Amino acid sequence: AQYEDGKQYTTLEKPVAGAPQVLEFFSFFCPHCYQFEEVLHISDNVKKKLPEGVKMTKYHVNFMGGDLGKDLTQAWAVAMALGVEDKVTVPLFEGVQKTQTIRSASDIRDVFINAGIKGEEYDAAWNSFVVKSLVAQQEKAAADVQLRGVPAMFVNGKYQLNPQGMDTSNMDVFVQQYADTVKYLSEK
Numbered sequence: 001a002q003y004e005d006g007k008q009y010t011t012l013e014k015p016v017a018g019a020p021q022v023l024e025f026f027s028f029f030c031p032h033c034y035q036f037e038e039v040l041h042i043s044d045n046v047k048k049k050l051p052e053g054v055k056m057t058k059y060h061v062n063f064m065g066g067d068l069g070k071d072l073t074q075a076w077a078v079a080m081a082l083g084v085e086d087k088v089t090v091p092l093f094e095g096v097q098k099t100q101t102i103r104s105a106s107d108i109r110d111v112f113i114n115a116g117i118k119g120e121e122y123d124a125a126w127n128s129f130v131v132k133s134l135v136a137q138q139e140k141a142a143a144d145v146q147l148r149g150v151p152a153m154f155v156n157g158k159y160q161l162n163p164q165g166m167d168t169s170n171m172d173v174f175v176q177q178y179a180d181t182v183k184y185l186s187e188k
């Protein structure tokens with residue numbers, strides 16, 4: 001077969017029922033995740049190869065960065081609750097990994113203020129039980145797959161992308177192989 005278990009993807013031994021159709025995990029501390037966002041735009045290119053309106057879900061993880069890692073999972077919940085993911089993803093990645101200006105929850109909040117989220121609006125969300133629920137959802141989804149590494153993408157709770165088994169001499173070719181694999185898996 002052109003697509004083979006163990007090559008472009010692996011099959012979960014314990015599939016996860018009722019999972020999101022396309023589920024990505026990342027950390028703002030994760031170096032390949034930085035590439036996946038700013039250099040490769042993996043999520044956008046996957047979406048462009050899937051049918052219109054299909055659910056893509058993207059969740060932050062706790063297991064990198066200690067205290068701040070957990071603050072970032074909560075901030076991602078705020079971003080999802082307010083719908084401002086596209087406004088804060090790049091400045092959070094660059095503040096953690098490029099300028100290293102994010103050292104505290106207050107620095108995370110500054111990114112949202114600078115992106116135009118009002119202070120009262122950010123603080124109300126940060127402390128909301130709706131956001132507590134979104135944090136729990138992010139934790140539960142990672143726990144469902146005993147997630148120990150990012151970037152990770154899961155398709156229908158059954159298949160895990162294997163980018164290590166793709167060619168990376170050409171960055172566009174890699175993105176295309178990755179997106180085409182998600183499409184193939186989604187059609188299984």
Ligand SMILES: Cc1cc(Oc2ccc(CC(=O)N3CCOCC3)cc2)ccc1C#N
Nearest residue numbers: 032035039148149150151163164168171174
């Ligand atoms: C073109 C390109 C390809 C890449 O392939 C990748 C190689 C490995 C991973 C997995 C990984 O790192 N994990 C998962 C579990 O273990 C802990 C961390 C992801 C992508 C990476 C970067 C770039 C660029 N630019």
